[PDB]
Amino acid sequence: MNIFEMLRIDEGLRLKIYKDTEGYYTIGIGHLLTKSPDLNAAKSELDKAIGRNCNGVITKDEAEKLFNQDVDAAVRGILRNAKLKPVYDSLDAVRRCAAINQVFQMGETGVAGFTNSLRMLQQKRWDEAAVNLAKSRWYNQTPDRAKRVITTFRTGTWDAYK
Numbered sequence: 001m002n003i004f005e006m007l008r009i010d011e012g013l014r015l016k017i018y019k020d021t022e023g024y025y026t027i028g029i030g031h032l033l034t035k036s037p038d039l040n041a042a043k044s045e046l047d048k049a050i051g052r053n054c055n056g057v058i059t060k061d062e063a064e065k066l067f068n069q070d071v072d073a074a075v076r077g078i079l080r081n082a083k084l085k086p087v088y089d090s091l092d093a094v095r096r097c098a099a100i101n102q103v104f105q106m107g108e109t110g111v112a113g114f115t116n117s118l119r120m121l122q123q124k125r126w127d128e129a130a131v132n133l134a135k136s137r138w139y140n141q142t143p144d145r146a147k148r149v150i151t152t153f154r155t156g157t158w159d160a161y162k
């Protein structure tokens, strides 16, 4: 297991524009296209992202290309974030994947409500962190996925990903 296999399990792979768990136009391996309810806006974003007229459909290679970019940008975003970087740097590699997964799903603005969890993670108070992590809109809206990511934060193992 590594971050790609992990997020591939959590995000799935769909080659045509679909709506994510939040109802937002998405394609590929959790590549968010837009929050706009306008499908034409999403199709425009898609063509922009891929560099050709896709008419709402891409290939597996193109999905994986966006996925590579998206994972990379999540990591680079964490590293530029004054609040996230020291926590992330304190973590071992497996728990770092949990952090990337969370940011990938919810963005940095999302992981901002997680001040208390972040402190507990930095302190390596793993069971406390895991309890705090689950007290969230995140967990309640996507509980099976959040349980996997939280187990990853709690144990630093890939147990939840089989």
Ligand SMILES: COc1ccccc1O
Binding pocket: 078, 084, 085, 087, 088, 098, 099, 100, 102, 103, 111, 114, 117, 118, 121
């Ligand atoms: C709350 O989990 C994180 C820890 C460190 C960096 C990013 C995170 O989402």
